[PDB]
A paper describes a structure:
MSP2 is one of the most abundant and polymorphic glycosylphosphatidylinositol (GPI)-anchored proteins on the surface of the P. falciparum merozoite, the invasive blood-stage form of the malaria parasite. All variants of MSP2 share conserved N- and C-terminal regions but fall into two allelic families, 3D7 and FC27, distinguished by tandem repeats and dimorphic flanking sequences within the central region of the protein1416. Here, we use the mouse monoclonal antibody (mAb) 6D8, which recognizes a conserved N-terminal epitope on recombinant MSP224 but does not recognize the parasite surface, to gain insights into epitope masking and strain specificity of the antibody response to MSP2. The mAb 6D8 was first demonstrated to bind the conserved N-terminus of MSP224, with the epitope localized to residues 11 to 23 (MSP211-23).
To determine the structural basis for 6D8 epitope masking by lipid interactions, we have solved the X-ray crystal structure of the N-terminal epitope MSP214–22 in complex with the Fv region of mAb 6D8 (6D8 Fv) to 1.2 Å resolution. Our results indicate that, despite the moderate α-helical propensity of the 6D8 epitope in MSP2 and the stabilizing effect of lipid interactions, the antibody stabilizes only a single turn of helix in the peptide. This turn of helix spans residues Asn14–Met18, and breaks at Ser19, allowing the carbonyl of this residue to make hydrogen bonds to 6D8 through the side chains of Asn38L and Thr95L (6D8 is numbered according to Kabat29, with the chain indicated by a superscript). The helix is terminated by an unusually long capping motif involving two side-chain to main-chain hydrogen bonds, one between Nε of Arg22 and the carbonyl of Tyr16 and the other between the hydroxyl of Ser19 and the carbonyl of Ala14. This unusual motif positions Arg22 for simultaneous intra-molecular cation-π interactions with the Tyr16 side chain and an inter-molecular salt bridge with Asp32H. The complex is further stabilized by hydrogen bonds between peptide residues Tyr16, Ser19, Arg22 and 6D8 residues Asp31H, Val101H and Asn96L, respectively, as well as van der Waals interactions involving the hydrophobic MSP2 residues Ala15, Met18 and Ile20. In the lipid-bound conformation, the side chains of Arg22 and Tyr16 are separated by ~15 Å and are clearly precluded from the interactions jointly made with CDR H1 in the 6D8 complex. Similarly, this helical conformation would also prevent the carbonyl of Ser19 from engaging CDRs L1 and L3. Furthermore, lipid interactions are expected to bury the hydrophobic face of this amphipathic helix, preventing access to the key hydrophobic residues that mediate recognition by 6D8, including Tyr16, Met18 and Ile20. The structure of MSP214–22 bound to 6D8 Fv is therefore incompatible with the structure adopted by MSP2 on a lipid surface, which offers a clear explanation for the failure of 6D8 to recognize lipid-bound MSP2.
Residue numbers in the entry:
A (entry chain Q): 14 to 22
B (entry chain B): 1 to 111
C (entry chain A): 1 to 114
The structure:
Amino acid sequence: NAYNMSIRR
Amino acid sequence: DIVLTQSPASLAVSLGQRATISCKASQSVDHDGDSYMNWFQQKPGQSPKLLIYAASNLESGIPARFSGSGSGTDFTLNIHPVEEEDAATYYCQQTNEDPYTFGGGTKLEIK
Amino acid sequence: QVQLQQSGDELVKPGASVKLSCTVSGFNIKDDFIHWMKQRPEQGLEWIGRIDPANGYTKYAPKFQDKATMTADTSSNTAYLQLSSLASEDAAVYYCATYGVAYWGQGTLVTVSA
């Protein structure tokens, strides 16, 4: 889930 | 832009104790109920390693001795207990607004 | 399974340009942005920008807008960082990252000669 939430998309 | 200020700049901690590192953002890094603050660990000669994302999520592969808290402008990384291998420099990073920015780092030593 | 393999260290002359590479394996780069970071011992970590390899769209930090050019090639699964008009303050370690910003390359050292 770092893909989704380690940056703001 | 968002400025991130870490506290302390360095600290020496006894093996087995708790440690906290603080990161304060100059403006909020919240959006839609989430806080876009990451924590990284770096050892000399190596790339930064992601510990925590979106303030409180533990990255896969990272021990649960590490945890994150906070929202808005005020964040913390907690290490419980500290172990020998934790000697490193720790950075916060916000990814809520462009340009992404990093704190100045906190160097942890084990005494 | 995801590896970001960066190119070797470079010694560069003032005024010149250099192009660094970030070869990704175990991940299709069309699937996410690639980010570039700069690290100096005194000034710390800075985000240069990100590129979307699927469409070539780029976003830079203002301080890197006339220094860095990011490109990418999905076919070779490689991203590039070109640094122009090199000066002493460009000497640094440069990193690429993806999967949000969870996975980082090993870094490429750029040294600038006198």
